[PDB]
Amino acid sequence: AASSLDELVALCKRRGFIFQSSEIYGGLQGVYDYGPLGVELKNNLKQAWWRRNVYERDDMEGLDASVLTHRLVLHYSGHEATFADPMVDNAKARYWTPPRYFNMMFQDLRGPRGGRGLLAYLRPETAQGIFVNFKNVLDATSRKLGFGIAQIGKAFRNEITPRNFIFRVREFEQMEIEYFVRPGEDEYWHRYWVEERLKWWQEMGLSRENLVPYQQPPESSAHYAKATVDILYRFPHGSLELEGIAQRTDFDLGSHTKDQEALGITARVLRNEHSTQRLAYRDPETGKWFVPYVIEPSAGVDRGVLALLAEAFTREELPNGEERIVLKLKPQLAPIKVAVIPLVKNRPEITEYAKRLKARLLALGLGRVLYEDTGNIGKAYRRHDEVGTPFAVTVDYDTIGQSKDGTTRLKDTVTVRDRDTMEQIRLHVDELEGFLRERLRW
C-alpha cells in the first residue's frame, strides 16, 4: 500500500500519470489531465472491464451515448428537482449570502442565444443515456429479459468541493451497467452483481483486505435506489466509495416511458407528459407488458485508478542501498509490459538491435513494449519500477556479438530484470518470447 495521498499525487506528476488540468494558467481545480502513463493505465482498466462485462458475457449489449443531454431527460430523471430550492445563507447558519440554487449539473445552451428553450446539461452520470435508449436497443438486438446494456463514459458534476486528488472531481468517467430484470428477481440479481463486481476488483489487484461492501441505510438510500451497496476501498485518506452496486427499481424506465399509468409502475415516478415511446418489455410466455427493474453497477474509472495506484505503490527498502518506490501493478495492467534498454547509448549497432527487439516483442501481443533509450540504466531501471512495468530487458555488447573476453556465446541472449524480485536472469532472445507469454498473458 501507498502511505499518503500526497506521495501518490507526487508520483503521478513526476511520472506523467496525472497532470493538473490547465496548469500553466492557474489550473481549473477539480479537473485533471491524464498524462502518458496515466492514459495507458486508464485505458487498460477500461478495456479489461469491457472484456469482462461484455465480451465474456452473453446477456449484455454495449452502448456509448453522448455527453450532451436534452433538458427534459434530466428533468423526468428527477435530477432537476434536486436543485429547485434556493439557499439564502447567512452569518452562522445555512439555507445573508444571496440565494444560490446550488445545482450540481453543469449547464449549456444550444446555439443562437441563452434561452431556456435551447438548454442542455452535461450528463452528471452515464446512466440516463441507457434508460432513454432502452427501446432503441431492445429493437435492434431483440433481447430476451435476463439482460443488460453497458457503457463507459464521461460524467460532469459541478462538485461544490473537489477533494483528494483524482477522487471527487468535476469531470470524470464511469463504467456503468444497467441490468434489466423481471420484477421478482431483482433481489438475486442485486446480490449476484455485488459479488461479481467485488470478484472483479480483486482480480484487478485490490486486496480483499481493503475492499468492503457496505449496505447504504434508508437515510442514504437516494431516491431511485430501493437499495444500494457500495464497495468501499481503504484509500490512503480513508475507506471511501469505489463502486456503487445500486438497485433502482423500474423508476428510471418508469420516469421515462409513455403510458406510465397503463404500465404497472411500482415506483413513485413523475407524470411523464413527454416520452415519444413506451420504454417497457413485453413477453415472458404470457405477453404481459411490464417495466423491468434494474441492478446498476457504477464504478468510477478515475477512482479505480486511484485505488490501483494506492494499492500498488509499495516502497520497499533495498538490502544494499536505501529504498525504492515500486508500483506493483497487475502486469497485465501496467502502462508498459516490457521495456527494452540499450546498455550504451553510443553503439548504434546495439541500439539498432534494441529497437529491433522491441518490435519482435510488441508482436507477441502481450501489450505495450517500450524502447527506453534514457541515459543511466540505473536511472532507466528505476524510472520503470516507479511506473510499475513488469520486465526490463537490457541489451549490451555481448548480445550483439562483441565483448572483452572475445566471447560471442553471450550473443542473442539478453538480461531480463524483474520488477518485484529485482532478480536478473540472462536469457536468449527466443526464450524471452515464451517467458513473457507465461507472465503477461491474462
Ligand X SMILES: Nc1ncnc2c1ncn2[C@@H]1O[C@H](COP(=O)([O-])OC(=O)C[NH3+])[C@@H](O)[C@H]1O
Binding residues for substrate: 125, 172-176, 296-300
List the grid coordinates of 433.
Answer: 518470447
Instruction: Name 128's Cβ contacts closer than 8 Å, sequence gap at least 6.
Output: 69, 73, 74, 77, 252
Classified as helix, coil or strand, 12 is helix
Nearest approach in angstroms of CB 86 to ligand X is: 23
Which residue is nearest to ligand X, using beta carbons?
Answer: 300
Instruction: Report which of 239, 301, 329, 303 is spatially closest to residue 15, judged by C-alpha positions.
Output: 329
Looking at 42, 123, 198, 243, which residue binds ligand X (CB under 6 A)? 243
Nearest approach in angstroms of CB 52 to ligand X is: 17
Q: Indicate the Cα dihedral angle 325, 331, 332, 335, nearest 10°.
A: 40
296 or 396, CB closer to ligand X?
296
Residue 172 as a binder of ligand X (CB under 6 A): the answer is yes
125 or 385, CB closer to ligand X?
125
- Count interface residues toward ligand X (CB under 6 A): 19
Residue 169 as a binder of ligand X (CB under 6 A): the answer is yes
Instruction: Write out the binding residues for ATP.
Output: 157-159, 167-172, 241-242, 300-303
Nearest approach in angstroms of CB 167 to ligand X is: 6
Instruction: Report which of 13, 21, 20 is spatially closest to residue 37, judged by C-alpha positions.
Output: 13
Nearest approach in angstroms of CB 157 to ligand X is: 5
**Side chain identity at residue 266, one-letter code:** T
**Euclidean distance between CA atoms 416 and 424, whole angstroms:** 6
Host H or E run for residue 16? none
Burial class (CB within 10 angstroms; exposed 0-12, middle 13-18, buried 19+) of 144: exposed
303 or 358, CB closer to ligand X?
303
Residue 174 as a binder of ligand X (CB under 6 A): the answer is yes
218 or 378, CB closer to ligand X?
218
Residue 125 as a binder of ligand X (CB under 6 A): the answer is yes
Residue 168 as a binder of ligand X (CB under 6 A): the answer is yes
Residue 69 as a binder of ligand X (CB under 6 A): the answer is no
Q: Where are the beta strands (DSSP E) in 209-318?
A: 211-215, 225-234, 239-248, 293-300, 313-314
Classified as helix, coil or strand, 21 is coil
- Applying the rule CB under 6 A, the residues between 130 and 159 that interact with ligand X are 157, 159
Looking at 148, 205, 236, 244, which residue binds ligand X (CB under 6 A)? 244
Nearest approach in angstroms of CB 141 to ligand X is: 22
Identify the residue whose cell numbers are 541500439: 351
Contact stretch for ligand X (CB under 6 A) within 73-81, 237-245, 322-330, 366-374: 237-245
Residue 332 as a binder of ligand X (CB under 6 A): the answer is no
Instruction: Name 154's Cβ contacts closer than 8 Å, sequence gap at least 6.
Output: 67, 122, 123, 126, 171, 172, 173
Chain residues that interact with ligand X, rule: CB under 6 A: 125, 127, 157, 159, 168-169, 172, 174, 176, 241-244, 296, 298-300, 302-303
